[PDB]
Amino acid sequence: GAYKYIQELWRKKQSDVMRFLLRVRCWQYRQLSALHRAPRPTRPDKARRLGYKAKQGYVIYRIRVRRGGRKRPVPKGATYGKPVHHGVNQLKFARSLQSVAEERAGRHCGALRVLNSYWVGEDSTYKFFEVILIDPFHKAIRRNPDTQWITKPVHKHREMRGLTSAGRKSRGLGKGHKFHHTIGGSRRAAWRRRNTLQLHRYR
Amino acid sequence: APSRNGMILKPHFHKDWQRRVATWFNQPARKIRRRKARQARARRIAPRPAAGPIRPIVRCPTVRYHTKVRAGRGFSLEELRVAGIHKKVARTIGISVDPRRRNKSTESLQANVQRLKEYRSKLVLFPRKPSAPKKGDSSAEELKLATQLTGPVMPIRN
Amino acid sequence: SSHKTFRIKRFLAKKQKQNRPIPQWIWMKTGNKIRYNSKRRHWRRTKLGL
Amino acid sequence: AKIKARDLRGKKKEELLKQLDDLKVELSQLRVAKVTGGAASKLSKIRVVRKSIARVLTVINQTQKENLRKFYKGKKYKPLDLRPKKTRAMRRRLNKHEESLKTKKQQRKERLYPLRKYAVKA
Amino acid sequence: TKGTSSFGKRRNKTHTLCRRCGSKAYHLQKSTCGKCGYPAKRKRKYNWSAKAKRRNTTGTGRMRHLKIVYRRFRHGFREGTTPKPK
Amino acid sequence: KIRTSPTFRRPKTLRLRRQPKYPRKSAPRRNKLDHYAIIKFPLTTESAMKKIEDNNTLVFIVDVKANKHQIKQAVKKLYDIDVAKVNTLIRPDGEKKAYVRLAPDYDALDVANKIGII
RNA sequence: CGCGACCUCAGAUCAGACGUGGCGACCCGCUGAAUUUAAGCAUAUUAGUCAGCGGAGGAAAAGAAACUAACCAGGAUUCCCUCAGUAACGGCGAGUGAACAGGGAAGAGCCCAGCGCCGAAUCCCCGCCCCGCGGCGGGGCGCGGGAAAUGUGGCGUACGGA
Ligand SMILES: [Mg+2]
Ligand SMILES: [Mg+2]
Ligand SMILES: [Mg+2]
Ligand SMILES: [Mg+2]
Ligand SMILES: [Mg+2]
Ligand SMILES: [Mg+2]
Ligand SMILES: [Mg+2]
Ligand SMILES: [Mg+2]
Ligand SMILES: [Mg+2]
Ligand SMILES: [Mg+2]
Ligand SMILES: [Mg+2]
Ligand SMILES: [Mg+2]
Ligand SMILES: [Mg+2]
Ligand SMILES: [Mg+2]
Ligand SMILES: [Mg+2]
Ligand SMILES: [Mg+2]
Ligand SMILES: [Mg+2]
Ligand SMILES: [Mg+2]
Ligand SMILES: [Mg+2]
Ligand SMILES: [Mg+2]
Ligand SMILES: [Mg+2]
Ligand SMILES: [Mg+2]
Ligand SMILES: [Mg+2]
Ligand SMILES: [Mg+2]
Ligand SMILES: [Mg+2]
Ligand SMILES: [Mg+2]
Ligand SMILES: [Mg+2]
Ligand SMILES: [Zn+2]
């Protein structure tokens, strides 16, 4: 099939052809708006890996995220306290810019529901992400039993709770010795389960 | 300010622990709730055992415990292939199946195959339609005598 | 203010009707616990907020 | 007479409007009698007139809206007042047939491997 | 002269009766409500104002829709059915 | 086609009117501001009777949501009498007092004796 | 220059739907101190805590190993006892501090992209007939309109599959 050729063609990014394509696409997407609709995917293979199909009610938004770390929103210095917390410039935001892209697309569209998202281009000042959005209300999704879990009200705003992949990569969850701080439900559930007194009846 | 003689101690009460105090007064009500849910499952599956499907003779890892024998997650695929039971038939006839397990030892392999051979003989399979029985079904004298087994089915004794 | 608005005039109109006392038959009931109107606002004592 | 709601349903809509207008004239006359200073019979009669107006308007609204939903019953699209007003999260659910829609592979699994009925011996 | 003589110059009003929360906390210059934040789409509530929470909750006012939601819930939200007539 | 202006405005596209398949509400809401409901009662004040006897008017108490044209058509439809003018005020009680100046062909005292007030 | 497709982008009080906001005890994602302690205090501690922000549900989250172990090997997730105030972190000071395994409550497994085979074998909307219509569904008739080869559906997913 053609998809494996397209897959390793998108893998080999350092070549002349793909550097030319990333430069032209990143230029065009920088001239476009910060949030708009792509009527077709730029990476159809990567969209198919993430779960996009070619049917009605599957929408793709191309949005941009301004690139860089997160500085502390305070006046000039003036973090009133001990010298640990005077760091303002070199702070980093806990979630990734792809998850920032997902939550911005999901906040712009409360009706549409985020499936996942992928990278298409980056500038020094911006990154560019295609976010896959799904109707939970169109009949082609609603009558399909494979995707009707999207139509359930449990998956409302996955992009804010971190249920998509770019949010799950920021939660630090997993199995094994490297993920002890999120055993249980999450990191908060781990901390709450560890910091309780089990004061029994008969003790 | 410590006195004359005593143990050094580190009380972990420097956080705000009084907000997160799990009181255990739900305990006898939860015992009643587990009891009612277990009796509800036992009344739901009427000929089937109240415990569940059978669980393998399992050696323990981690050299402190390897003399002891547990009841495991499920039977191995090589165990099912030697015993001659398909892995999708086994889940329907009440057999725990997991694909993650391996078979390094031959003795535990033969023991779980023998336990499958014993469970296939002890199993009383009811027909799908009562009016038209099939080839692989139990007899009408066993249809009346079949009943539940209280506790774990074939309890593994060390 | 002689230059009133309709909302402020309606708000004053409700308070002018609330300012009236209780009738004499209301304390002849069985389970009465009201001797008088305790919400009598006078125009010098309480200045209605605002 | 005591205007009951049973005989108002069988009558024609124009007779309901004429009786409504007669009750409105009767209410206006009792309000004029109250302001001029009237009898306590009229002061108790005005409540009966108000409840009779409420009954007549209720019967008119029944004969209107049940006929409207009888008209829009056979059609697929019906107005929002005639659509069933329950809670929003219950209206935004899946359909009863869509909760029963399974895939072909899942139906093949349910055909080939049903949960068998079995028992064990002691 | 910061007290009694300065209190006499108080005649122009800054706040007025709001039209979403009802309290007299709608500032005219900023055109916003100091009680609930009226030009904002959301209700202004805070967790440091724990007593000011319970002054304005669901248990405070009428619940003219929520009580019949509860009444329809306790019989399973039946719609259109009528009881057996005489 | 030549570009006359250096600007490029948005071209006038075609748009359609509302042709809905079904109406939003099932029935139109009835006029709850009826002629009977818009006129509550006439006043029996000594000053109101002096106004009726002197200036050939009628003093009514009206719901606050009304218009002068609504009061005029309401009096004309209910009591079958023509109206010269309507003067409205809103009382500190809340209701709208209406001085309905009648035409001089009909008598205010005669129509007051007809409706009952004295 | 005119006509006809495709691609991008508009305008609609176009036909049919959805989101906005509230509660917020429990749950998820961020952001996030200072009181206090260290008999001072600056690392630490209070503390991923208070406050702030967004999002749901009747539970949420997690969840069927890019796992634990090194044993005669166990075998999704969640919760309890124990591991254990232990290994370990810490002006190694004050203090902080798990995980494996064992005993239990419960126990349920799976689906795609790819790789490939099947005349797109697939999906949505509108017209007519029959049933039912207060969770707008099932069948038939339409040289009706679109979506889709820049890939819909069936077999099939690491336990092998065709
Ligand atoms: Mg510090
Ligand atoms: Mg952080
Ligand atoms: Mg999940
Ligand atoms: Mg990583
Ligand atoms: Mg001492
Ligand atoms: Mg001592
Ligand atoms: Mg058990
Ligand atoms: Mg004064
Ligand atoms: Mg399939
Ligand atoms: Mg001012
Ligand atoms: Mg809010
Ligand atoms: Mg429209
Ligand atoms: Mg909300
Ligand atoms: Mg100190
Ligand atoms: Mg001190
Ligand atoms: Mg000090
Ligand atoms: Mg900390
Ligand atoms: Mg907080
Ligand atoms: Mg809810
Ligand atoms: Mg869940
Ligand atoms: Mg484990
Ligand atoms: Mg110990
Ligand atoms: Mg030291
Ligand atoms: Mg700590
Ligand atoms: Mg364990
Ligand atoms: Mg395919
Ligand atoms: Mg797997
Ligand atoms: Zn307000």
Max intra-chain CA distance, chain A? 74
For residue A42, how many other CB atoms are within 10 A of its CB? 19
Taking alpha carbons only, the member of F68, F72, F54, F64 closest to residue F108 is: F54
Residue corresponding to tokens 């998809």: A3
- Cross-strand partners of A61: A37, A131
Amino acid symbol at E84: K
Rounded Cα distance between B45 and B94, Å, is 12
Rounded Cα distance between D55 and D2, Å, is 11
> Rg of the Cα trace of chain C?
15
Residue corresponding to tokens 């659509």: D83
Residue corresponding to tokens 């104002």: E49
Any CB–CB contact under 8 A between C12 and chain F? yes
Taking alpha carbons only, the member of D58, D67, D45 closest to residue D16 is: D58
DSSP for residue A3: H
Any CB–CB contact under 8 A between F94 and chain C? yes
Q: Which residues of F touch D81 (CB under 8 A)?
A: 25-27
Rounded Cα distance between A171 and A168, Å, is 5
Tokens (6 digits) for F13: 């596209």
Tokens (6 digits) for A4: 């494996």
Instruction: Please tell me which residue lies nearest to nucleotide G62, judged from CA to C1'.
Output: A185
For residue E49, how many other CB atoms are within 10 A of its CB? 11
Rounded Cα distance between B138 and F73, Å, is 92
From the list D36, D64, D80, the residue facing F117 with the nearest CB is D36
Give the CA distances from residue D104 to residues A135, A146, B27, D95, in Å, rounded to whole numbers and listed in that order: 23, 11, 46, 19
Helix ranges (DSSP H) in A32-157: 44-50, 97-108, 139-142
Helix ranges (DSSP H) in D5-39: 13-36
Helix/strand/coil for A83: coil
Amino acid symbol at A197: L
Rounded Cα distance between A117 and A128, Å, is 10
Q: Which residues of E touch C7 (CB under 8 A)?
A: 17
Torsion A24-A25-A29-A32 (CA) sign: positive
Ligand nearest, relative to CA of residue E25: 28
Rounded Cα distance between A84 and A87, Å, is 7
Tokens (6 digits) for A137: 């209300």
Tokens (6 digits) for A99: 């998850």
Any CB–CB contact under 8 A between C18 and chain F? no
Rounded to the nearest 5 degrees, what angle is found at the Cα of B76, between the Cα atoms of B72 and B82?
130
Q: Which residues of B touch D121 (CB under 8 A)?
A: 122, 124, 146, 149
Residue corresponding to tokens 């109109």: C13
Residue B22 and residue A192: Cβ atoms within 8 Å?
no
Separation of A181 CA from ligand 17 center, angstroms? 13
Strands ordered across the beta sheet of F83-90:
F39-42, F57-62, F96-102, F83-90
Rounded Cα distance between E60 and F101, Å, is 49
Give the CA distances from residue C7 to residues C17, E35, F62, in Å, rounded to whole numbers and listed in that order: 16, 19, 18
Separation of A40 CA from ligand 26 center, angstroms? 18
Chain D window 68-97: residues with CB closer than 7 Å to nucleic chain G are 69, 73-78, 84-86, 88-89, 91-97
Q: Collect all residues with Cβ–Cβ distance below 8 Å to D112 and sequence separation of at least 6.
A: B88
Tokens (6 digits) for A173: 């969850």
Q: Tell me whether strands F57-62 and F96-102 are parallel, antiparallel or unpaired.
A: antiparallel
| Cα dihedral E46→E51→E56→E62 (10° resolution) | 150
Q: Are A183 and A194 in contact (CB under 8 A)?
A: no
Counting CB pairs under 8 A, whether chains C and E reach 3 or more, is yes
Three-class HEC string of E19-48: CCCCCEEEECCCCCECCCCCCCCCCCCCCC
Mutate which of F33, F35, F36 to disrupt the D interface (most D C-beta within 10 Å)? Answer: F36
Report the nucleotide nearest the CA of residue B8, measured to C1'.
G85
Rounded Cα distance between E68 and B88, Å, is 50
Rounded Cα distance between F69 and D116, Å, is 82
> Which chain D residues have any C-beta within 8 angstroms of a chain B C-beta?
112-122
Rounded Cα distance between B69 and B60, Å, is 6
Ligand nearest, relative to CA of residue F18: 12
Rounded Cα distance between A3 and F4, Å, is 50
Q: Tell me whether strands A197-199 and B21-23 are parallel, antiparallel or unpaired.
A: parallel
Burial of B85 (0-12, 13-18, 19+ CB in 10 A): buried
Nearest CA in chain D to B92: D115
**Which backbone phi and psi does D23 adopt, to 5 degrees?**
-70, -30
Smallest CA–CA separation between E42 and chain C, in Å? 24
Nearest CA in chain A to B23: A199
DSSP for residue B54: B
Tokens (6 digits) for E2: 């910061």
Phi-psi region of A157 (alpha: psi -120 to 50; beta: other; left: phi over 0): left
Q: Give the resolution in Å.
A: 3.0
Q: Which residues of D touch A152 (CB under 8 A)?
A: 94
Chain B window 42-71: residues with CB closer than 7 Å to nucleic chain G are 52-53, 55-56, 58-68, 70-71
Q: Are D52 and D16 in contact (CB under 8 A)?
A: no
DSSP for residue F104: T
Rounded Cα distance between F89 and C9, Å, is 13
Mutate which of C10, C11, C18, C19 to disrupt the F interface (most F C-beta within 10 Å)? Answer: C10
Q: Which long-range contacts (CB under 8 A, 24 or more apart) does C9-17 make?
A: C9/F90, C9/F92, C10/F94, C11/E17, C12/C48, C12/F92, C13/F91, C13/F92, C13/F93, C13/F94, C14/F94, C15/C41, C15/C48, C16/F92, C16/F93, C17/F93, C17/F94
Q: Collect all residues with Cβ–Cβ distance below 8 Å to B98 and sequence separation of at least 6.
A: B73, B74, B75, B76
Rounded to the nearest 5 degrees, what angle is found at the Cα of E77, between the Cα atoms of E73 and E83?
115
Smallest CA–CA separation between F89 and chain C, in Å? 12
Smallest CA–CA separation between F92 and chain D, in Å? 19
Judge whether residue B135 contacts strand G, using its CB and a 7 Å cut-off: no
Q: How many CB pairs under 8 A join D and F?
A: 52
Q: Which long-range contacts (CB under 8 A, 24 or more apart) does F12-21 make?
A: F21/D77
Q: Which residues of F touch D80 (CB under 8 A)?
A: 24-26
Tokens (6 digits) for A159: 């992009």
Rounded to the nearest 5 degrees, what angle is found at the Cα of A107, between the Cα atoms of A106 and A108?
90
Rounded Cα distance between A52 and A115, Å, is 8
Residue A142 and residue D89: Cβ atoms within 8 Å?
no
B111: Cα within 13 Å, side-chain hemisphere:
13
- Cross-strand partners of F58: F100
Judge whether residue B90 contacts strand G, using its CB and a 7 Å cut-off: no
Give the CA distances from residue F104 to residues B47, F75, F83, in Å, rounded to whole numbers and listed in that order: 100, 15, 9
Q: Are F24 and F33 in contact (CB under 8 A)?
A: no
For residue B101, how many other CB atoms are within 10 A of its CB? 17
Rounded Cα distance between D43 and D31, Å, is 9
